Amino acid sequence: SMRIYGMNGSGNCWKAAQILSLTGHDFEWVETSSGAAGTRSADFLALNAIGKVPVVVLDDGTALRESNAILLHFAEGTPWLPPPGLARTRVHEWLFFEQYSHEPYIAVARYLKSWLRQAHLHEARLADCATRGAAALDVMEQHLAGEPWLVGEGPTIADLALFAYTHRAEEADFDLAQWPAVLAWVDRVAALPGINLIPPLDEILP
Amino acid sequence: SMRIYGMNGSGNCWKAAQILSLTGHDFEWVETSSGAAGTRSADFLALNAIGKVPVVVLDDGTALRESNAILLHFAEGTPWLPPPGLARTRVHEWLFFEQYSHEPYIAVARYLKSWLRQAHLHEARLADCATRGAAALDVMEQHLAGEPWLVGEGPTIADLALFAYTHRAEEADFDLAQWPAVLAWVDRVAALPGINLIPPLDEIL
Numbered sequence: 001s002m003r004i005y006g007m008n009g010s011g012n013c014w015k016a017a018q019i020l021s022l023t024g025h026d027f028e029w030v031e032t033s034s035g036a037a038g039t040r041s042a043d044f045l046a047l048n049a050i051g052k053v054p055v056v057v058l059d060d061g062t063a064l065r066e067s068n069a070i071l072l073h074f075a076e077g078t079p080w081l082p083p084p085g086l087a088r089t090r091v092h093e094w095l096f097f098e099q100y101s102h103e104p105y106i107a108v109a110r111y112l113k114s115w116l117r118q119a120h121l122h123e124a125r126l127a128d129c130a131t132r133g134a135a136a137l138d139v140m141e142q143h144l145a146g147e148p149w150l151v152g153e154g155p156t157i158a159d160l161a162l163f164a165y166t167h168r169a170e171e172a173d174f175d176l177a178q179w180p181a182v183l184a185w186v187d188r189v190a191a192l193p194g195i196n197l198i199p200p201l202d203e204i205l206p
Numbered sequence: 207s208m209r210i211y212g213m214n215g216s217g218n219c220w221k222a223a224q225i226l227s228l229t230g231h232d233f234e235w236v237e238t239s240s241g242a243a244g245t246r247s248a249d250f251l252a253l254n255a256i257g258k259v260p261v262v263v264l265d266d267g268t269a270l271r272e273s274n275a276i277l278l279h280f281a282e283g284t285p286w287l288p289p290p291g292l293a294r295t296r297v298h299e300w301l302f303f304e305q306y307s308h309e310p311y312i313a314v315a316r317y318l319k320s321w322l323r324q325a326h327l328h329e330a331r332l333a334d335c336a337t338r339g340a341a342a343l344d345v346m347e348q349h350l351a352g353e354p355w356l357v358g359e360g361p362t363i364a365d366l367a368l369f370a371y372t373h374r375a376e377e378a379d380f381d382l383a384q385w386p387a388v389l390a391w392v393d394r395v396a397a398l399p400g401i402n403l404i405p406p407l408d409e410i411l
């Protein structure tokens with residue numbers, strides 16, 4: 001039976017659970033810690049040498065890693081992933097934008113401020129995050145002011161990939177009211193059948 | 207005719223030029239500055255709101271961005287990219303690992319040290335790059351010690367994506383002799399027909 005190794009509250013892990021649920025796959029969740037008892041354990045590194053969650057393990061033992069690769073793997077042949085061509089390429093562009101220009105600022109600031117509550121250890125990092133995260137939101141705003149979805153005329157895994165952390169941007173100290181087209185898109189994605197939100201970290205973390 | 211907006215010496219821009227030449231596409235290179243005269247100019251931001259090179263613009267006006275998306279776009283239907291399935295997923299995994307775990311350390315160290323020659327101004331960051339870049343090479347080494355290519359039995363865009371900066375790792379002060387499987391793989395990729403190396407940055411300056 002299929003397993004997701006993940007951390008409760010993680011947007012990257014949410015991507016994996018969300019696409020599995022959207023595409024009709026049953027799975028077992030395995031709560032995995034950070035460090036020698038989890039992501040840096042012998043057993044885990046045997047699944048993923050990179051030492052990161054999410055990892056999805058198929059009933060045949062195959063271990064899949066990288067949240068955006070997991071989105072691509074399970075969305076293949078569904079309306080969540082266009083076929084090769086311009087639309088698929090536009091999806092790819094947003095997924096690499098997400099990993100390079102968005103996640104490292106939004107997800108990280110949320111982690112440091114609302115998960116660890118270590119704002120004080122990362123003043124420099126956090127100011128940079130605030131600036132570069134705002135720039136990533138500006139890119140999303142510019143696009144979503146003119147089209148309601150990231151690609152083509154309907155939702156795709158590009159929307160899922162950027163929704164993962166953007167829907168919880170308040171925990172990274174971003175006020176989405178200042179990016180009204182992004183806010184409207186967050187609401188549009190949240191209203192889609194089958195989409196679930198990450199509850200507030202304060203309510204799910206020990 | 208097709209254009210590539212890029213920076214000479216850039217590994218990410220090399221990915222675009224390299225896949226276009228491997229797949230038989232002629233292109234015009236357009237050198238693009240960093241900042242108001244290039245990547246942050248109004249004309250360039252109209253092509254790519256992210257304000258980053260490479261950008262590939264087709265004759266019909268279509269502007270493509272993100273070096274790994276550009277690899278995916280032009281490799282589709284060629285031996286460089288398998289059709290959907292497990293091997294194709296393995297390719298994706300390496301492309302995301304490259305962007306998240308490898309490029310931000312190896313490409314950035316190379317740029318700050320060997321392009322800008324400002325190592326003295328980025329101490330904490332470059333120490334972090336040295337540590338995390340080494341970890342990324344360890345992942346590559348563990349794989350490549352057991353097989354010659356990143357995915358399956360032959361070269362794919364996974365190899366191209368990782369080769370782009372790894373082949374010039376010496377400019378970020380990584381000695382590839384210390385990762386012998388990665389060293390062997392760099393030579394293996396470099397020997398494929400039509401693969402061109404990025405010239406040393408000291409020849410470009």
Ligand SMILES: N[C@@H](CCC(=O)N[C@@H](CS)C(=O)NCC(=O)O)C(=O)O
Nearest residue numbers: 010012034039052053054066067306
């Ligand atoms: N590029 C990866 C990044 C995943 C990632 O950063 N995972 C984190 C949690 S959100 C992790 O496993 N932390 C590393 C550790 O604890 O060692 C992806 O999108 O899957």
Ligand SMILES: N[C@@H](CCC(=O)N[C@@H](CS)C(=O)NCC(=O)O)C(=O)O
Nearest residue numbers: 100218241245257258259260272273
């Ligand atoms: N994820 C991008 C990264 C590209 C990138 O970092 N390009 C830099 C090269 S210096 C850039 O254009 N930055 C210019 C700017 O931000 O103004 C890709 O792979 O294409």
